[PDB]
Write a protein that binds this ligand. Structure first.
Ligand code: HEM
Length: 366
């Protein structure tokens, strides 16, 4: 739908279609994403229940409604600072050796004759790495796989309530059982003024926030380098870092994100009222020609590359450096093992927000 995007960016960068507002240009989406005083992330009524939550008035509730993701400062900033260092420079750099062997190990499990990279590499890598970060038994890998579907970017769909209940029951249970059998991060959360529901939420967020998204990054990366025949150039010129940033821009794992108007506001020429939902098209902004020259083309050594795939502002993705660090090592290690890659079959994930693949069958030449 990138062609429509380009038409909207030129005619109605800030457009209203009846029920919701939609922003298509880099300029305005960055604005919406950065300006929290006017465009809020309090979509689950977290701020309205913070007292009854920290007072005990509220006993049970879906924990995912109360995380740094659905909050505005100061609350947002209080929550984020508890773990804002676990995904740091020196910090993650120490997970490097672990990430390499892990992918190296996963690579060993592939059958070049024919195989699915999504299932054998793209799916497991992030899960195994986050389990290690959180201190959870890598043996419950499969469980984490199914709960990953609960990620916040995914909207509803008919007759799915029973399955979700089953997932939530087990998810919440699993997390309760391991609250004191965790790392420094979980410890910090467990020993905060936060409520029980909030602590559960926190852990679940850190747990499933980057599984499906990072998996999509790796898959999209393989598809793009392959279809544009960039593998040799990338190994030869060593463009992994930049090439991954271009993949993030061209094939964004999260196509859009939402905000709610905290009050009346004027975005560009439009005056969005108070309480209206504003859809921010990340995929569109990323092809903005004013900002990105030759944006429709995949330029592997683009630089700089100020894309908005990890968002912008105070909510800029907490695990971005991890995500980057993970994709880069997988791609490096992948490009070293197989000599040529043949794309045999593909099944795209059927979601409007999450952009990625369900299956990716390839024949590799060692
Ligand atoms: C390529 C992979 C990923 C992409 C494209 C992605 C994208 C995003 C985007 C678009 C946001 C901003 C949401 C908004 O502003 O409304 C976000 C938030 C967040 N992401 Fe990621 N993400 C990825 C991987 C990860 C990883 C590996 C983790 C690690 C646990 C993670 C943890 C989070 C958290 C905790 C937030 C909330 C930050 C806050 O509200 O302060 N993400 N992500």
């Amino acid at each position: 739908m990138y062609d429509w995007f380009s038409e909207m960016r030129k005619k109605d960068p800030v457009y209203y279609d009846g029920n919701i507002w939609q922003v298509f240009s880099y300029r305005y989406t960055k604005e919406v994403l950065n300006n929290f005083s006017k465009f809020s992330s309090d979509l689950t009524g977290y701020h309205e229940r913070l007292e009854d939550l920290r007072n005990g008035k509220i006993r049970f509730d879906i924990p995912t409604r109360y995380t740094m993701l659905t909050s505005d400062p100061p609350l947002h900033d209080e929550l984020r600072s508890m773990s804002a260092d676990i995904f740091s420079p020196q910090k993650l750099q120490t997970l490097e050796t672990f990430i390499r062997e892990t992918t190296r190990s996963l690579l060993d499990s592939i059958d070049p004759r024919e195989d699915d990279i999504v299932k054998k590499l793209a799916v497991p890598l992030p899960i195994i790495v986050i389990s290690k970060i959180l201190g959870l038994p890598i043996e419950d890998k499969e469980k984490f796989k199914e709960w990953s579907d609960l990620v916040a970017f995914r909207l509803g769909k008919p007759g799915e309530i029973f399955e979700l209940g089953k997932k939530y029951l087990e998810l919440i249970g699993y997390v309760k059982d391991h609250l004191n059998s965790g790392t420094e991060v979980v410890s910090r959360v467990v020993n905060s003024n936060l409520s029980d529901i909030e602590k559960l939420g926190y852990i679940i967020l850190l747990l499933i926030a980057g599984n499906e998204t990072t998996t999509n990054l790796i898959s999209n990366s393989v598809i793009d380098f392959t279809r544009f025949n960039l593998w040799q150039r990338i190994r030869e010129e060593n463009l992994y870092l930049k090439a991954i940033e271009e993949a993030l821009r061209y094939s964004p794992p999260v196509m859009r994100t939402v905000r709610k108007t905290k009050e009346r506001v004027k975005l560009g020429d439009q005056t969005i009222e108070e309480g209206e939902y504003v859809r921010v098209w990340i995929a569109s902004a990323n092809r903005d020609e004013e900002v990105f020259h030759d944006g429709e083309k995949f330029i592997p050594d683009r630089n700089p590359n100020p894309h908005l795939s990890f968002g912008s502002g105070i909510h800029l993705c907490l695990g971005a450096p991890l995500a980057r660090l993970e994709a880069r090592i997988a791609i490096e290690e992948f490009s070293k093992r197989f000599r040529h890659i043949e794309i045999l079959d593909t099944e795209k994930v059927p979601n409007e927000v999450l952009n990625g693949y369900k299956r990716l069958v390839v024949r590799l030449k060692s």
